[PDB]
């Protein structure tokens, strides 16, 4: 535990599960007053009870929901000091034509547009106040090819939006960065194992360190960038991926040189 | 003029103006049978008359329009050999909160989703046929910071989608690449001068030029052609050195004449 | 039919073999007056006889050789219109400690420093004359991880130097770009097969298009960038790799769908 | 507390001044046993008196110096747990031809080759023991164009080498990452002000946050990556630049909105 965020209001979207839960837990253990924001109130309530945080009902796919949630935070607590955008959904890894356009649309709406909605609603007041730190959650899938024709582009959009906002709000004292997880142990990744969409040993083999990343490891990088340890860092994308991005190019040379 | 695309069916979206028009002109001068596709039927027809191409009514923001256009092409001409995705719109350069969410949505719908709609509708038949070349139009704005919180992310999405498709369809023999224009002289840029200042754009590029639509088209046509037979999944900036020049300010700026 | 150079003077380093040979051949077929430059005069002569170009002895690891070559070009032909830096060497794919420091030093000296030597010697006069186009040869190995602790860094150095020079000389009308080949069929790649450092089917499998790149395919990209068809392109790195950079990230999803 | 190292041995090169000094200081405050390594014993002694660390004479431009220093660390303390490569030099911002080749060579030898020498000498034993964390210092100048035809390429080389080593040694449990500072307040930057090579207000204006980066701010990112809080991070380049990389592209739109 630490006092690094004592007094800080930290809104974490998607905080009921996975990466957002781990960020909420670490921010709370670091002293922050965490707003546990999720569309799933049961999950958010469980996390808030464990962290001492406060729940906020938030559907990032619904403009009215985001606007209302932002107004509730301002009225009840104050201008957010930290915003972490973890709400997101995955997609089936289907090629164009097999992937339903409806599925493509949902991924874009939640993962890119929903992050924009929250940055605008929670972050514009930060720029007005002249202080704040925003951390978005992108993905290695936003950085390289893969069978994710909605999720890849949406996460690449998050990397871009992190850069555009960092330039817009830098002169107003707000830092905006993003973390790009590799394959991270969460209930979403477990559902991929259950549908046989992914295989755990295949994911380990695809990473230079031979590990699947833990939600807590992602949260450490988010909290670093959200904190004053990162006071000079803005507009960056930090991959936390156990070396996934490193390993793929070794196959032409016979693969990683393993134990 | 050349025969490099003799016999090829080349669908160009947004071909009524600007970059798409220059691509249609150069593809036609290179021998292709150009399908001049646009939401603006009068503009498409002017370009088709000049190029010997054929018009195709296409609104990349309407799924039914894209599906019908792809079906017309397949029945009247055949499977496309080349698809160039130039249809697109710009946005007002407003910060979050000032930019209307409706404006953000339109840009994402046309510039990213509309390119996906056309890649799926025209490009899946290419993958089934085991040959084709697709060139998307991104932007330097998809590569660096700027005051375009819809357009930047959408164009970054185009760069990503070019990569994801190149991997999906590489084993089926379809190459997918993208060109990222800098500031390019088109009627859309002229509307910016009447938001943007021409001297400022020249100063922001290492070569001191605004890119012409024809210069963009040369890069598109290179990537679409067999001169690029081993090139897939790449983003080619055609920007007069905009991406190069910004980092010089800390050292006193470009060292000019 | 790829471009027209109208007699432009084009100096190609490493032009006796592989990528440089293919660049010299296509430039000559495209109307350029090619200067076939190489450390191996016998290989340069063979290529120059086939291209109608002229030979130039050039060892990019020897400062005096680069200076003397630039002086010969200036006196005999004039300032170059095009420079293509293809001279290069590979390395054994050994981890640090197994890799001899002497091997590391050679690769850095030839592949990065030697390209800098030629850009300074042949390219500064281009900037003085307010025109020219320079194409460097980097590699996908300068863009991603691999067992190449000298060659990767040197080729990443070439990508950077392309950007730095593009900015220095952009205002003087000189474009500077680079091509990053993937695995390309040359005698240097053949030595990787013979020594069993590389396996041809493994290289095809590692590319989204399932091919090894040909030297001519690299030359087409070099010639495009060197030509007026690329008059607005500067400071860019163009990968020509059959989709090597694309394919590696698919393994986590079960690999390429073949 | 930024991190806890529990007595881990941390070798910091260039630790007598600037970024290396700040890294040594924060590592010591975070519980590491710091080895303050520098070519200048006087500066290293001053830093080590403040950190309780131990001094090591190290010239990263002399192979025998690096080898002897690694042997002394192994003999006196053990295999390093952490290595931070901060030894470096800048260059005059001159175009090719005006920049002496001797100046180009020094920058490449110290900034890229010297980092490779240290990664090989101190890092191969880490891979052998199956544990360690290495942080290299690159620069934003290794990521974008500028008037730095040696320093840009050398620092791009460091970003590459970080990736190549991360792949080589990842399977042996060693993480390798790098930090790319922007303009950072050190004696080296002050020499740029004194020579009027740089102007402080120009550097602030070129960053989205309007600041010059402090040496301590760089050290925080180095210590995060070196620590177990970054146990899943390898092969990455983390810019710490107050938004320099963000700001340049705004000029076309009228500049930053201040
Ligand atoms: N798990 C991975 O391997 C991985 C990898 C890369 C990126 N990511 C990204 O990290 C973030 C979280 O991933 P996760 O693994 O923690 O998934 P998760 O399913 O375990 O948690 C996601 C949370 O987001 C909430 N949520 C979903 N849609 C929402 C909506 N419209 N409005 C509000 N809340 C919504 C969910 O209720 C859920 O609690 C996502 O952006 C994900 O794309 C995850
Ligand atoms: N001009 C530049 O500086 C510049 C820079 C970077 C990127 N781009 C991109 O190049 C592409 C073309 O730009 P331009 O300068 O030629 O603009 P332009 O206005 O001159 O031409 C754009 C064409 O797209 C058509 N179009 C717009 N929406 C459409 C829709 N839903 N369906 C079908 N057609 C539609 C328009 O009718 C028009 O004919 C765009 O993607 C643009 O974002 C332009
Ligand atoms: N073949 C590939 O797969 C591949 C991949 C990526 C990059 N590259 C790069 O392409 C360029 C050409 O490679 P290649 O495959 O054609 O090799 P190659 O052996 O077929 O030809 C290389 C030429 O460079 C000459 N040369 C070597 N050192 C020289 C020196 N100091 N001075 C003058 N000439 C010298 C050689 O005599 C030879 O003629 C190199 O830079 C290489 O690193 C090659
Ligand atoms: N200051 C900046 O703005 C900035 C920006 C980007 C990157 N960097 C990089 O950070 C690192 C340190 O920069 P700094 O500002 O702290 O410089 P500095 O002059 O303040 O300190 C550098 C230290 O490196 C030592 N050193 C130099 N050459 C050496 C050699 N052969 N062997 C051993 N020690 C040697 C010096 O004795 C000195 O103590 C460098 O790699 C630099 O390139 C600095």
Candidates A41, A86, A162: which one to mutate for ligand 1, based on the most atoms within 8 Å of Cβ?
A: A86
Paired tokens of A125:
């007041």
The single-letter DSSP state of residue B233 is: S
Distances (CA, A) of A102 to A164, B87, C178: 28, 22, 41
Beta-bridge partner residues of B54: B35
Instruction: Determine, for residues B93 and D253 on separate chains, whether the beta-carbon distance falls below 8 Å.
Output: yes
C61, C87, C222, C237, best to mutate for ligand 3 pocket (most atoms within 8 Å of CB): C87
Q: Please report, for residues C10, C68, D102, D139, the alpha-carbon distance to residue C64 in angstroms, rounded to integers and kept in the order given.
A: 21, 6, 14, 32
Contacts of B158 (CB under 8 A, 6+ apart): A153, B85, B111, B112, B115, B136, B137, B138, B142, B178
Q: Determine whether B49 is exposed, middle or buried from the number of CB atoms within 10 Å of its CB (0-12, 13-18, 19+).
A: exposed
Are C49 and C57 contacting, i.e. CB atoms less than 8 angstroms apart? no
Q: Determine the atom of ligand 4 nearest the C-alpha atom of D185.
A: 1
Q: Alpha carbon of A58 to those of A42, A109, C156: distances in Å?
A: 13, 14, 45
> Would you name the residues of D annotated as active-site residues?
151
- Which subunits have 3 or more CB–CB pairs within 8 Å of chain C? A, B, D
Q: Which residue has the tokens 């859309």?
A: B188
Q: Which two tokens stand for residue B55?
A: 């018009």
Contact of D163 with chain C, judged by CB distance below 8 Å, is answered with yes
Q: DSSP secondary-structure letter at A209?
A: T
Atom of ligand 2 nearest to the CA of B191: 19
- Compute the distance between CA of residue B17 and CA of residue B14 in angstroms, rounded to an integer: 7
Q: For residue B181, which atom of ligand 2 is closest to its CA? A: 6
Alpha helix ranges (H) inside chain B: 18-29, 41-51, 63-76, 101-107, 114-118, 124-129, 151-169, 187-193, 198-203, 213-224, 242-245
Ligand 4 mean position, distance from CA A58 (Å): 48
Question: Which ligand gives the minimal distance to the CA of B45?
Answer: 2
**Which resolution in angstroms does this entry have?**
1.5
Place of tokens 């890069």: B219
Closest ligand to D85 CA? 4
Q: How far is B256 from chain D (nearest CA, A)?
A: 13
Partners of C253 on chain A (C-beta within 8 Å) are 93, 146-147, 198
* Residue found under tokens 């004592």: A6
Cα–Cα distance for residue pair B252/A64, rounded to 1 Å? 47
Q: Return left, alpha or beta for D10; rule: phi > 0 is left, psi -120 to 50 is alpha, else beta.
A: beta
Residue C109 per-residue DSSP state: I
3-class SS at A251?
helix
Alpha-carbon torsion, ordered C58, C59, C60, C63, to 10 deg: -100
Say yes or no: C239 contacts chain B, CB-CB below 8 A. Answer: yes
Ordered DSSP codes for chain D? -----TT-EEEEETTTSHHHHHHHHHHHHTT-EEEEEES-HHHHHHHHHHHS-EEEE--TT-HHHHHHHHHHHHHHT-S-SEEEE--------PPBTTB-HHHHHHHIIIIIIHHHHHIIIIIHHHHHHT-EEEEEE--GGGTS--S-TTHHHHHHHHHHHHHHHHHHHGGGTEEEEEEEE-SEESHHHHHHHHTTS--HHHHHHTSTT--PEEHHHHHHHHHHHHSGGGTT--S-EEEESTTHHHHGGGGGGTS---
B5 DSSP 8-state letter: T
- CB hemisphere CA count around D158 (13 angstroms): 39
Which ranges of chain A does DSSP label H, i.e. alpha helix? Answer: 18-29, 41-51, 63-76, 101-107, 114-118, 124-129, 151-169, 187-194, 200-205, 215-226, 244-247
- The C-alpha atoms of residue D187 and residue D40 are separated, in whole angstroms, by 14
Quick check: CB of D192 below 6 Å from ligand 4?
no
Q: Are D214 and D208 in contact (CB under 8 A)?
A: no
Q: Can you tell me which atom of ligand 4 is nearest the CA of D61?
A: 31
Which residue is closest to D233 within chain A, CA to CA? A240
D135: contact with C, CB 8 A cutoff: no
> Whole-angstrom Cα distance, residue B34 to residue D172?
56
Annotated binding site of B for NAD(+): 17, 19, 38-39, 59-61, 88, 151, 155, 184, 186, 191
Technique behind the model: X-ray
For residue D181 and ligand 4, the question of a CB distance below 6 A is answered with yes
Q: Give the distance, in angstroms, between the CA of residue B16 and the centroid of all CA atoms in the same chain.
A: 13
| CA C160 to mean position of chain CA atoms | 14
Centre a 10 Å sphere on the Cβ of residue D174 and count the other Cβ atoms it contains.
Answer: 25
Residue with tokens 């090597």: C244
* C161–B contact, CB cutoff 8 A: no
Closest residue in chain D to residue C112, using alpha carbons only: D153
Please report which helix (H) or strand (E) contains residue C43, including its range: helix C41-51
C218 lines ligand 3 (CB under 6 A): no
Helix and strand numbers (H, E) in chain B are: 11, 9
Question: Which residues are bridge partners to D96 per DSSP?
Answer: D99
- Report CA(A19)–ligand 1 centroid distance (Å): 7
Q: Angle at which helices C215-226 and C18-29 pack, to 10 degrees?
A: 50
Active-site residue B116, yes or no? Answer: no
CB-CB neighbors (< 8 A) of C168 in chain D: 95-96, 147, 149
Q: Which of D172, D207, D232 sits opposite A242 (nearest CB)?
A: D232
Chain C interface, best mutation among B26, B168, B170, B226, by max C CB count within 10 A: B170
Please count the other Cβ atoms lying within 10 Å of the Cβ belonging to residue C79.
18
Residues flagged as binding site of B: 17, 19, 38-39, 59-61, 88, 151, 155, 184, 186, 191
Cα–Cα distance, A16 to A24 (Å, whole number): 9
Name residue C132's beta-bridge partners.
Answer: C174
- Our answer on whether the CB atom of A133 is closer than 6 Å to any ligand 1 atom is no
Task: Name all domains of chain A by residue range, CATH numbers in brackets.
Answer: 1-259 (3.40.50.720)
- The Cα–Cα gap between B60 and C6 comes to 43
Judged by a CB distance cut-off of 8 A, whether residue D211 touches chain A is yes
- Burial track B129-167 (b if 16+ CB lie within 10 A, e otherwise): eeebbbbbbbbbbbbbbbbbbbbbbbbbbbbbbbbbbbb
């Amino acid at each position: 535990a630490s006092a690094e965020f004592n007094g800080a209001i930290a809104v974490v979207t998607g905080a009921g599960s996975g990466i957002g839960r781990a960020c909420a837990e670490l921010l709370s253990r670091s002293g922050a007053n965490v707003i546990v924001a999720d569309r799933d109130i049961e999950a958010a309530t469980r996390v808030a009870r464990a962290t001492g945080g406060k729940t906020l009902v938030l559907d990032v796919g619904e403009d009215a929901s985001v606007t209302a949630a932002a107004n509730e935070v301002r009225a009840r607590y104050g201008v957010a000091d930290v915003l972490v955008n973890c709400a997101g959904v995955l997609q089936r890894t289907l090629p164009p034509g097999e992937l339903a356009q409806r599925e493509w649309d949902v991924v874009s709406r939640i993962d890119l547009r929903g992050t924009y909605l929250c940055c605008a609603a929670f972050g514009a007041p930060m720029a007005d106040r002249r202080r704040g730190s925003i951390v978005n959650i992108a993905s290695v899938a936003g950085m390289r090819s893969g069978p994710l024709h909605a999720y890849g582009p949406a996460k690449a959009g998050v990397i871009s939006l992190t850069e555009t906002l960092a330039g817009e709000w830098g002169p107003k004292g707000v830092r905006v960065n993003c973390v790009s997880p590799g394959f991270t142990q969460t209930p979403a990744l477990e559902r991929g194992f259950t549908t046989h969409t992914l295989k755990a040993d295949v994911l380990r083999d695809a990473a230079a360190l031979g590990h699947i990343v833990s939600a807590n490891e992602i949260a450490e990088a988010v909290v670093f960038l959200a904190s004053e340890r990162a006071s000079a860092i803005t507009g960056v994308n930090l991959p936390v991926d156990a070396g996934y991005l490193i390993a793929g190019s070794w196959a032409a040379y016979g693969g990683l040189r393993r134990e």
